[PDB]
Amino acid sequence: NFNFNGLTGTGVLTESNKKFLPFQQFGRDIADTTDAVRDPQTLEILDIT
Amino acid sequence: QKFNGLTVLPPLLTDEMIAQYTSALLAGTI
Numbered sequence: 001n002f003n004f005n006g007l008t009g010t011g012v013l014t015e016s017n018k019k020f021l022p023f024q025q026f027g028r029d030i031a032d033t034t035d036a037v038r039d040p041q042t043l044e045i046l047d048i049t
Numbered sequence: 050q051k052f053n054g055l056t057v058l059p060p061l062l063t064d065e066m067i068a069q070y071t072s073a074l075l076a077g078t079i
C-alpha cells in the first residue's frame with residue numbers, strides 16, 4: 001500500500017529503465033493510471049504494477 | 050493483466066492450432 005506523497009495505492013515496486021525529466025515526477029500510460037513513480041529521497045525510476 | 054480489474058481471457062483456440070484447422074480445411078478441398 002505505497003504512499004508516495006499522498007498517492008495511496010497497491011502495487012509492486014521494481015526499478016525501471018525509464019528516464020523522467022528533472023521536474024517530472026509521475027508516470028502515466030494511455031489509460032491515465034499511475035505506472036511510474038520517482039522516489040522523493042533517492043531519485044530513481046520505479047515501475048508500479 | 051490490466052490495473053483495474055479488467056482481465057483478458059485468452060481464446061480457447063490459440064493462433065497456432067487454428068492455423069492447423071485452416072490447413073486442414075485447405076487440404077481437403079485441394
Ligand SMILES: *[C@@H]1O[C@H](CO)[C@@H](O[C@@H]2O[C@H](CO)[C@@H](O)[C@H](O)[C@H]2NC(C)=O)[C@H](O)[C@H]1NC(C)=O
Nearest residue numbers: 005022023024025038039040041042043044045
Ligand atoms: C535526502 O537525504 C538523504 C539522506 O540519506 C540523501 O541520501 C544521501 O545521498 C548521498 C548522495 O551522494 C549519498 O552519498 C549518501 O550516502 C546518502 N545517505 C545515506 C544515509 O546513504 C539524499 O541524497 C537526499 N536527497 C535530497 C534530494 O536532498
